[PDB]
Design a protein around this ligand. Structure first.
Ligand code: BCL
Ligand code: BCL
Ligand SMILES: CC[C@H]1c2cc3[nH]c4c(c3C)C(=O)[C@H](C(=O)OC)c4c3nc(cc4[nH]c(cc(n2)[C@@H]1C)c(C(C)=O)c4C)[C@@H](C)[C@@H]3CCC(=O)OC/C=C(\C)CCC[C@H](C)CCC[C@H](C)CCCC(C)C
Ligand SMILES: CC[C@H]1c2cc3[nH]c4c(c3C)C(=O)[C@H](C(=O)OC)c4c3nc(cc4[nH]c(cc(n2)[C@@H]1C)c(C(C)=O)c4C)[C@@H](C)[C@@H]3CCC(=O)OC/C=C(\C)CCC[C@H](C)CCC[C@H](C)CCCC(C)C
Ligand SMILES: CCCCCCCCCCCCCCCCCC(=O)OC[C@H](COP(=O)(O)OCCN)OC(=O)CCCCCCCCCCCCCCCCC
Ligand SMILES: CCCCCCCCCCCCCCCCCC(=O)OC[C@H](COP(=O)(O)OCCN)OC(=O)CCCCCCCCCCCCCCCCC
Ligand SMILES: COC(C)(C)C/C=C/C(C)=C/C=C/C(C)=C/C=C/C(C)=C/C=C/C=C(C)/C=C/C=C(/C)CC/C=C(/C)CCC=C(C)C
Ligand SMILES: COC(C)(C)C/C=C/C(C)=C/C=C/C(C)=C/C=C/C(C)=C/C=C/C=C(C)/C=C/C=C(/C)CC/C=C(\C)CCC=C(C)C
Ligand SMILES: COC(C)(C)C/C=C/C(C)=C/C=C/C(C)=C/C=C/C(C)=C/C=C/C=C(C)/C=C/C=C(\C)CC/C=C(\C)CCC=C(C)C
Ligand SMILES: COC(C)(C)C/C=C/C(C)=C/C=C/C(C)=C/C=C/C(C)=C/C=C/C=C(C)/C=C/C=C(\C)CC/C=C(\C)CCC=C(C)C
Ligand SMILES: COC(C)(C)C/C=C/C(C)=C/C=C/C(C)=C/C=C/C(C)=C/C=C/C=C(C)/C=C/C=C(\C)CC/C=C(\C)CCC=C(C)C
Ligand SMILES: COC(C)(C)C/C=C/C(C)=C/C=C/C(C)=C/C=C/C(C)=C/C=C/C=C(C)\C=C\C=C(/C)CC/C=C(\C)CCC=C(C)C
Ligand SMILES: [Fe+3]
Lengths: 304, 281, 245, 54, 63, 44, 44, 44, 54, 44, 54, 44, 42, 39
């Protein structure tokens, strides 16, 4: 019956915050506004966004990749808007066949896929540069860029590094809703029950642990919002009763606890681990191990 | 031993059962009545898993597996050497999890905080009970639950998923996968943002929450807020687990065919089913 | 490199998994050591140094540079001393370790147990511009944009009695969030009620944490328009302690 | 030794009694379950074979 | 309201026995709560499965 | 006078006497049930 | 022996009585569930 | 003359005496049960 | 050597006694289960073969 | 003397004497059990 | 060297003793498991062959 | 002449003497066990 | 000096460390000689 | 609180019992009607 602090009971709003200047060019910032629907669980302000060069490059090339996939879908639909909606999740932009290897393929036979992939790679690199530079101009510690680098590592292993090591673009997943799920299932089938890939198991452990740790941390912070526990930085420099009560709860529960700052180190490493181990697991599949169940039988965690 | 600030919080009260009978600490661990029950159930389950390893004849920790009774046994209490040991271990695990949640409730009452942590743990307990009790009983036998082994339960997951073709096509399953991915992404972002505010560029003073809001507004045009991000992470994790539980609840009880075939009502709507062209002709 | 072994059955996958095990061991050590910057060294029930301190050593000190020139060395004697409560009205219930400490007087007034407060620095929390983060709405230009406005509503306690009316709200200006409600008691005194421990009904504000008699002894703010971190901690501890007491 | 009583000068009897009760009940249950898991020493199955009702 | 102290001084033997019986009955009710919850969960799930179509009880074994 | 419960020695003795009487009654009921089961279906 | 009453000088009887009720009920339930495992003593 | 629990020497002696009486009763019952099982179903 | 008692100047007896009890219990259980997992040294199996229980 | 735990030298000596007596009894019982097992079923 | 005692001027005895005990136990367990996983040096298997237990 | 631990030179010497005695006992037992194994089943 | 040690303390600590290193290396050399005699790998 | 809970409980119990009767061919009143009237 008590207030659980999941939604605000009352909203207040004044002029929107336009952000600290620091070393940021304020000319690249857009105007801001308010959205009261978003103020129940979080902030109602759709604040200013930085435009810059990296953002422009990323937006242009990501839109190019999206529109390339879209026009390929329209071609597969034969210009029919009704076929486009009927088979939207069934359309697929496939990589070139294994015959062409890593060379540039004809448009109808994977060239469009290669063009879209190049646009996507340019967009992703530009967005990583944007993350790093937005951290730098405000004087922050670049942790977001390194965290993004792990996801980029998995993404590039799936589409670039493993196809290069296997000698053909054909092993890369296609651009499609249902088609890439089929690609995932077929990858598991072809490499002998990817369940038995040890790095796959590590990645699953890290994903489950990320969910578990975010549940723990969110519940802990909401439990100590009575004492202003969500003001984490001030608690880091000026420890209050919220941090002490959270630490004592977890110490009395499981015998050890964290600090207001080190819990976020736990969080960032747990979240990084899933993609970090997943990239390694995918890179090992086909290049080093082609049947993970037989490999597990050899190495003593599958029955013979 | 005690933390440098721990003494003023170790006060009596807050227990649910027994009053001050078990209101003490053992090292860092608060005990309580539910802590006593937790230690009993956990030790019994661990020793019974070891005994099942002895019966199996293997001491490799990655090969030990305790299997539930066969499907033909129904809901009967099975013999200990014919699946009954699995049932005893399941009872021990359920008791240990519930006792852990109630002990967390007691610790919350002693410290004067909310019960978000035990509620969130009860969500995972519900998922576990869905996989071992609710679904097997709705399917009519204990034999449909997963075994207690590090890789044999992965085999169970594989076989259960392939019972319905490619399990990716389950819609609640897609929702749960998306929620888990979003939870991992949000955890990475939150940890990175807090650490970057706390550990700025060398020579700079510590950043404020205003810096975090400015950073995420610059990057993507929106900031949810510290309270908002904590609420969002908790809700994302809880919804992911709940919708995974629903996806397993609907599979094999009200749906028995391929989910990829389920997805074809949209295609087979008569007003465009016969229209030539595209993927589905 | 399929089937290429360095020795025996040890191939690239085995090297990767063993390297990951070593890296994970080091990472666990590093993460545990980074979380030992507060609350150490360990003490016994008498406040003396504990003979056992754990297998993990305390890390080397790290410094936080504040915007106002103050330096905080988090694993230091000064940091522990600044946040240490003194003259606690507590008594051991047993000669053995691990038993609870009994409050000698009024636990809510003495600030022990669930009513414990930490002696935070007696200054208001500021934003990046140096302005006070939490200010009453009468000092700002903010307006209520959603929800129910509690200003002017009666305040009902946990014993079903009216103790006063809401006169103003205190708002986190950078976050645009209401954190406290200011209540004028029937005796004319003004108190601060945390937003996280009250409910706003259609016609009243209900506070089940404390009863009517306890509303008069809520800790006070020295200045009518400024609340410090120490005052926030004391008020929150007092209000949260009412659930047990 | 006649000086074993000094153990009560080291350990609090209440927590010792709680731990001893939990440990003894756990051990008895474990041994009974081990015997029941062995058909040769499962006294219910032995009685079933001896008297012959199922 | 269920777990109450006994007034040992100024207390009769019959009242003491009744009080011990009441305390043990309250303990038995507390211990019956999880047993009743588990029995209800199992039996309700089995009944719901009985109300399910015939294919629910014919799934291939996952082993 | 070692007491962790606030109970005097005589109160403890009387409480123990009542408790043991009830325990004996419980044992008797359990013995009757076991004899009934043994007659119906011996397990030895 | 005759000195067992001093257990009530160690543990408070009322809480002990509640815990004993819990333990006895759960033990009876466990024994019944164990008996259900063998058909010869399955009373259902 | 160290005493972590706060008990005196004679208090510890009395507690140990009662505890040893209880342990002796428990061990005697266990020995009788073991002898009965050894007669009924030898395991050696 | 007869100065090993000084170990109690380094480690508190209570923690050492608890750790020793846990260690000894786990070790004894592990060795018994290892013997039980081996049919050559499973005493229940040997008794069953000797007395013809099955 | 150096003492992290707060005990004195003589307290440590007395505690170690009692501990050594307990360890000696434990080892004697273990030796007897091993002799019995070796006679009944040698593992060498 | 007769000056190795100075290591105790560098390292705290308590953590060193705890780590040494854990390390020695784990090392002994590792060597015993390596011997047990080798049938030529598994003393239970050798005893079974020598005495005809199975 | 450094002391991170706070011990004196003589305290370190006494601690080392006791530690070396314990290590010598442990190593002697290990040597006897190895000799027994070598006699029973040589590995060279 | 980031450790707080002086020059003479560092010298004495290094001398004892080098003594221990020399003992370890001598034992390793003897072990390798025994292995090479028993089962040469070159 | 009591009235809403009672209403929910009664409605859910009635729905569940009606579904139990419907799934039983012996008591399925629609099945009885179609069998008797030759529908
Ligand atoms: C959720 C849907 C499926 C399932 C699908 C998968 C898949 C798919 C994978 C796993 C994996 C794992 N699963 Mg599983 N798993 C299920 C149910 C369970 C349950 C349970 C009682 O509900 C448990 C305890 C486990 C346990 C485990 C771990 C052995 C492993 C890593 C999980 C992890 O880090 O999580 C996050 C938790 C933490 C980070 C905290 C620490 C938890 C530790 C690691 C748990 C150890 C358990 C230990 C081996 C045995 C416990 C009993 C002992 C007597 C104590 N699974 C159900 C049936 N699980 C992965 C793996 O590597 O398998 C080999 C894997 O690939
Ligand atoms: C039948 C299918 C197979 C199987 C085949 C695979 C394959 C194949 C793969 C995985 C992968 C994953 N699987 Mg698996 N998997 C199975 C069963 C399971 C089960 C289970 C049964 O419960 C679980 C829990 C998992 C869990 C997981 C994850 C732990 C892991 C990585 C997830 C991730 O972050 O992905 C998605 C995250 C990314 C792709 C990172 C993206 C980064 C980029 C930079 C961001 C997007 C680009 C751009 C911005 C996009 C546009 C956005 C615009 C805003 C529109 N698998 C079975 C056995 N699984 C992966 C892995 O690492 O395996 C080792 C993988 O490649
Ligand atoms: C630790 C690993 C986890 C993780 C981490 C992670 N991801 C990150 C970060 C981090 C730490 C970032 O810093 C970065 C970020 O900025 O987040 C806000 C990012 C990010 N992770 C993203 C996605 C993402 N992460 C995923 C996964 C995960 N990321 C892991 C779980 C997934 C999954 C599960 O598949 C996805 C989809 C982005 C939100 C963002 C990176 C943004 C980016 O790269 O942008 C460049 C790409 C494009 C612009 C592509 C095109 C986008 C539109 C389709 C363009 C076309 C539409 C047009 C604009 C409008 C058309 C309108 C009409 C005309 C139709
Ligand atoms: C929002 C839901 C997410 C979540 C939440 C969550 N879990 C939690 C919490 C929360 C909020 C806690 O407060 C609680 C905790 O204390 O965490 C430190 C807990 C916890 N989550 C845990 C694990 C865990 N959570 C998981 C998942 C998640 N938990 C969800 C993603 C998983 C997965 C996906 O695999 C695991 C392994 C524990 C670390 C802890 C609960 C600890 C506990 O119950 O302790 C008492 C029990 C024991 C010490 C051991 C009992 C052993 C049994 C008696 C025998 C073994 C039986 C078992 C069935 C065998 C399984 C074999 C496997 C190979 C299958
Ligand atoms: C199994 C046999 C146990 C029988 C002992 C029964 C006594 C009840 C338990 C108990 O009293 O725990 C207290 C223990 C000692 O710590 P404490 O007494 O609080 O203070 C001493 C510090 N100078 O507090 C402790 O935490 C014990 C120290 C643990 C040392 C390592 C334990 C590893 C194995 C734990 C089990 C897993
Ligand atoms: C297999 C998975 C399960 C591992 C085994 C159980 C893990 C819990 C064991 C320890 C729990 C405990 O008893 O707490 C007390 C003990 C000591 O705590 P403390 O004395 O405070 O240490 C600092 C003092 N020098 O606790 C400690 O030792 C403190 C160090 C914590 C132990 C690390 C356990 C890892 C927990 C996460 C498991 C997954 C790791 C994934 C992380 C990825 C990167 C984020
Ligand atoms: C898997 O393992 C299995 C289950 C097979 C075997 C494991 C078995 C075990 C370990 C079983 C039991 C262990 C114990 C320890 C069982 C219980 C022992 C006790 C101590 C039972 C206590 C019974 C006490 C009872 C009911 C209380 C009696 C008191 C009753 C009311 C209150 C006293 C008031 C009395 C007024 C006066 C009435 C009596 C008369 C004669 C007028
Ligand atoms: C597959 O790879 C393999 C396993 C084959 C490789 C094999 C590897 C190795 C690496 C084997 C071992 C290397 C080592 C380093 C083995 C151990 C050497 C040691 C360092 C043994 C230590 C024995 C120490 C012992 C028993 C402790 C003696 C101390 C005893 C009580 C403590 C006494 C000291 C005291 C009490 C403090 C009291 C004094 C005062 C003044 C308070
Ligand atoms: C399959 O083989 C396996 C794996 C099972 C082998 C594993 C085996 C083990 C580990 C077996 C057992 C090891 C132990 C350690 C067994 C138990 C030994 C003990 C120490 C049993 C103690 C029974 C103690 C009993 C009955 C005493 C309870 C004491 C009492 C009633 C008296 C206390 C009440 C009191 C003293 C008065 C005190 C208060 C005042 C005011 C004087
Ligand atoms: C895979 O590898 C396998 C498992 C096959 C083999 C590996 C095996 C190993 C490594 C086995 C064991 C190694 C050890 C080291 C086992 C433990 C040996 C010990 C050290 C046993 C200690 C027994 C100590 C006992 C009974 C003593 C408990 C002490 C007591 C009763 C005495 C009580 C002391 C003091 C009461 C109170 C004094 C109080 C005052 C006020 C004077
Ligand atoms: C797959 O690739 C393979 C494995 C085949 C080849 C790869 C090979 C490598 C990488 C081999 C080795 C590289 C190294 C770098 C090996 C180690 C070289 C060292 C540096 C060995 C050092 C041994 C150091 C030892 C024994 C010293 C321990 C020191 C001590 C006892 C001295 C104690 C110090 C101080 C006590 C106390 C003094 C205090 C005062 C106050 C004076
Ligand atoms: C009316 O609608 C319009 C036409 C306006 C737009 C409608 C659009 C749609 C429907 C867009 C997209 C639908 C989908 C289904 C988009 C994609 C979803 C997915 C699932 C994309 C997944 C990509 C997944 C993975 C691994 C890709 C990783 C890609 C990479 C690393 C990129 C590789 C980069 C470069 C290969 C190769 C460079 C080499 C050369 C020779 C250029
Ligand atoms: Fe956080």
């Amino acid at each position: 019956a008590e207030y659980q602090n999941f939604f605000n009971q009352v909203q207040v709003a004044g002029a929107p915050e336009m952000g600290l200047k620091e070393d940021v060019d304020t000319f690249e910032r857009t105007p801001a506004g308010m959205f009261n629907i978003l103020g129940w669980m979080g902030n109602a302000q759709i604040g200013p966004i930085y435009l810059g060069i990296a953002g422009t490059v990323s937006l242009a090339f990501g839109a190019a990749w999206f529109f390339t996939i879209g026009v390929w879908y329209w071609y597969q639909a034969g210009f029919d808007p009704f076929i486009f909606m009927r088979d939207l999740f069934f359309f697929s932009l496939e990589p070139p066949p294994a015959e062409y290897g890593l060379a540039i393929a004809p448009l109808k036979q994977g060239g469009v896929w290669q063009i879209a992939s190049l646009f996507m790679a340019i967009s992703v690199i530009a967005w990583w540069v944007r993350v790093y530079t937005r951290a730098d101009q405000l004087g922050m510690g670049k942790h977001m860029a390194w965290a993004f680098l792990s996801a980029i590592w998995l993404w590039s292993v799936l589409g670039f590094w493993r196809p290069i090591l296997m000698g053909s673009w054909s092993v890369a997943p296609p651009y499609g809703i249902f088609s890439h799920l089929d690609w995932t299932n077929q990858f598991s089938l072809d490499h002998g029950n990817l369940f038995y890939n040890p790095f796959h198991g590590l990645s699953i452990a890290a994903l489950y642990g990320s969910a578990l740790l975010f549940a723990m941390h969110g519940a802990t912070i909401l439990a100590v919002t009575r004492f202003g526990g969500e003001r984490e930085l001030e608690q880091i420099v000026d420890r209050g009763t919220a941090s002490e009560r959270a630490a004592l709860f977890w110490r009395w529960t499981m015998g050890f606890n964290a600090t207001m700052e080190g819990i976020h180190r736990w969080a960032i490493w747990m979240a990084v681990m899933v993609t970090l181990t997943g990239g390694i697991g995918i890179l090992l599949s086909g290049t080093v191990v082609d049947n993970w169940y037989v490999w597990a039988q050899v190495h003593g965690y599958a029955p013979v | 031993a005690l933390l440098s600030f721990e003494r003023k919080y170790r006060v009596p009260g807050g227990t649910l059962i027994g009053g001050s009978l078990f209101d003490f600490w053992v090292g860092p661990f608060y005990v309580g009545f539910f802590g006593v029950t937790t230690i009993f159930f956990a030790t019994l389950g661990f020793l019974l898993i070891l005994w099942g390893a002895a019966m199996q004849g293997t001491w490799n920790p990655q090969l030990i597996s305790i299997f539930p009774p066969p499907v033909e046994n129904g809901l009967n209490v099975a013999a200990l050497d014919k699946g009954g040991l699995w049932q005893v271990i399941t009872v021990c695990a359920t008791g240990a999890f519930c006792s852990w949640a109630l002990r967390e409730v007691e610790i919350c009452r002693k410290l004067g905080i909310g019960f978000h942590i035990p509620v969130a743990f009860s969500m995972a307990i519900f998922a576990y009970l869905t996989l071992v009790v609710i679904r097997p009983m709705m399917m009519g036998s204990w034999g449909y639950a997963f075994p207690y082994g590090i890789w044999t339960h992965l085999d169970w997951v594989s076989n259960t998923g392939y019972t319905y073709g490619n399990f990716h096509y389950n819609p609640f399953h897609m929702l749960g996968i998306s929620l888990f991915f979003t939870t991992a992404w949000a955890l990475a972002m939150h940890g990175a943002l807090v650490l970057s505010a706390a550990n700025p560029v060398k020579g700079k003073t510590m950043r404020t929450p205003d810096h975090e809001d400015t950073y995420f507004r610059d990057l993507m045009g929106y900031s949810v807020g510290t309270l908002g991000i904590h609420r969002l992470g908790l809700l994302l994790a809880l919804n992911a687990v709940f919708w995974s539980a629903c996806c397993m609840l609907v599979s094999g009880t009200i749906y028995f065919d391929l989910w990829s075939d389920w997805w074809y009502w949209w295609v087979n709507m008569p007003f465009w089913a016969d229209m030539a062209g595209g993927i589905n002709g | 490199m399929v089937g290429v072994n360095f020795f025996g059955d040890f191939d690239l996958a085995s090297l990767a998994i063993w390297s990951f095990w070593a890296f994970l061991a080091y990472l666990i050590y590093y993460l545990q050591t980074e979380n030992m910057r507060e609350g150490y060294p360990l003490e016994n029930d008498d406040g003396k140094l504990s003979p056992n301190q754990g297998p993990f050593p305390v890390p080397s000190p790290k410094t936080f540079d504040l915007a106002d020139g103050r330096k905080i060395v988090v694993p230091s004697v000064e940091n522990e001393e600044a946040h240490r409560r003194t003259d606690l009205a507590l008594e051991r219930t047993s000669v053995n370790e691990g038993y609870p400490f009994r409050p000698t007087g009024n636990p809510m007034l003495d600030g022990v147990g669930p009513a414990s407060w930490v002696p935070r620095r007696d200054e208001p929390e500021v934003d990046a511009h140096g302005h006070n983060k939490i200010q009453p709405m009468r000092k700002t230009e903010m307006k209520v944009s959603a929800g129910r406005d509690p200003r002017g509503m009666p305040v009902q306690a946990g014993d079903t009695e009216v103790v006063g009316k809401i006169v103003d709200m205190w708002v986190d200006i950078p976050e645009q969030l209401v954190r406290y409600l200011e209540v004028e008691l029937n005796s004319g005194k003004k108190k601060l009620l945390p937003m996280t421990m009250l409910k706003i009904w259609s016609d009243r504000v209900r506070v089940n944490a404390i009863t009517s008699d306890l509303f008069d002894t809520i800790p006070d703010i020295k200045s009518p328009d400024v609340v410090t971190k120490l005052e926030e901690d004391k008020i929150s501890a007092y209000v949260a302690g009412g659930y047990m007491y | 030794m006649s000086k074993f009583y000094k153990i009560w000068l080291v350990f609090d009897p209440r927590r010792v009694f709680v731990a001893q009760g939990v440990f003894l009940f756990l051990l008895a249950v474990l041994i009974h379950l081990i015997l029941l898991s062995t058909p040769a020493f499962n006294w219910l199955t032995v009685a079933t074979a001896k008297h012959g009702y199922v | 309201m269920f777990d109450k102290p006994f007034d040992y001084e100024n207390g009769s033997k019959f009242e003491m026995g009744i009080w011990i019986g009441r305390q043990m009955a309250y303990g038995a009710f507390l211990g019956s709560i999880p047993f009743l919850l588990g029995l209800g969960l199992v039996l309700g799930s089995y009944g719901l499965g009985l109300m399910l179509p015939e294919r629910a009880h014919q799934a291939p074994s996952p082993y | 006078d070692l007491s962790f419960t606030g109970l005097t020695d005589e109160q403890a003795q009387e409480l123990h006497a009542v408790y043991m009487s009830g325990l004996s009654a419980f044992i008797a009921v359990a013995v009757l049930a076991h004899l009934a089961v043994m007659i119906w279906r011996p397990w030895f």
